[PDB]
Design a protein around this ligand. Structure first.
Ligand SMILES: [Mg+2]
Ligand SMILES: [Mg+2]
Lengths: 158, 160
C-alpha cells in the first residue's frame, strides 16, 4: 500500500487566518475552535463571542454555503436580515451577512458572518468568522464585531 | 484604536494534527473530493463508488465522547440501521473509537460505513481525526477487508 499523508502537496494544509480583537476582549483557547474570543467582562444572560474556523471543501464551496445560509434563513423564526454583501477579503472572494432571529421564542440571536474562499488547485479552503450576541446586546457589540470582520486577514502561505 | 491580532495557528490555537492512510495500488487519491484525505478505486463496481475520506478538525475537550453520543443519536434514526460492532480503541497511543454499520438510503441502496475516530489532545482543546470508508451493501464482500486494512494502518502525526 502506498502511504497517503496529510498534509501533502496535493492535499495541502489549511490556510491560516488572523483576527484583531479589542482591549475589552480576550482569546478563548478552550472554546474548541481555531479562533475564539469573548469579552473579558461579559454581561448577564447570553455570552457574546466570536469564533473562526477554516476547513477544506470542494470547488464551489462558497456558492454552496451561501445557498445553505439562504435555506437556513427560511427556517430561523422571525429572521431579520440587515444586509448581505459579495466582497473580497485580501482579494479572495468573500461573502458577508448580518441578521437576527428569535431562538425558541426565548432569546433574540444576532449574528455577523464572513466567509472567505481560498482556492487550491483541486479544492478550496473556507474561512468562516462568526460573531454572535443577543439582540439587546447589539448596541454594545455591533461596531466592535464590524471592526473584527473588517480587519480579518488570511495567510495562505503560512 | 490599535487592535492586536490573534493569528491561527499559534501556541494557544495550534495547527491540526497530520495523519496518514495507506491505500491499495488499485486505489488512487482524489484531491477533488474536497476533504483533507480521499481515495477511490481505479475501477469501481457499478452504481455506488466506494471511497474513503479523512478529516481532522479542532474541537473542545471531551469531543470524542460527544461525537460518540451524536453518532448514537444519528443511529436511532437511520433507516434499517444495522451495527456490526463498536468499541473504544487507541491509534498510535491516542484515545480512539471504531464503529461499523449500515443503513438504507432512499429506500434503494444499502450504505455500509466504517468509521475510526482519534482524539489528539492539545493543552486547552483537541483534534478529532475521522476516517470514514463507505461502500454499498452488495459491495462489502469485495471491499470490507480492504477497508479494514486502511483503518488498521491509519497513523497519526502529532506536532509537539
Ligand atoms: Mg452572486
Ligand atoms: Mg495576502
Amino acid at each position: 500500500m502506498p502511504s497517503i499523508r496529510y498534509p501533502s502537496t496535493e492535499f495541502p494544509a489549511l490556510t491560516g487566518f488572523t483576527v484583531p480583537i479589542p482591549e475589552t476582549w480576550q482569546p478563548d483557547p478552550t472554546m474548541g475552535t481555531q479562533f475564539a474570543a469573548r469579552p473579558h467582562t461579559p454581561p448577564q444572560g447570553f455570552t457574546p463571542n466570536i469564533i473562526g474556523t477554516v476547513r477544506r471543501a470542494a470547488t464551489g464551496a462558497l456558492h454552496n454555503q451561501r445557498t445553505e445560509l439562504d435555506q437556513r434563513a427560511t427556517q430561523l423564526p422571525d429572521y431579520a436580515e440587515r444586509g448581505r454583501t459579495e466582497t473580497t477579503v485580501d482579494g479572495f472572494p468573500a461573502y458577508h451577512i448580518e441578521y437576527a432571529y428569535r431562538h425558541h421564542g426565548t432569546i433574540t440571536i444576532a449574528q455577523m458572518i464572513t466567509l472567505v474562499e481560498v482556492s487550491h488547485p483541486h479544492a478550496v479552503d473556507i474561512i468562516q468568522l462568526t460573531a454572535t450576541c443577543a439582540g439587546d446586546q447589539t448596541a454594545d457589540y455591533w461596531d466592535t464585531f464590524r471592526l473584527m470582520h473588517a480587519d480579518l486577514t488570511v495567510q495562505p502561505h503560512g
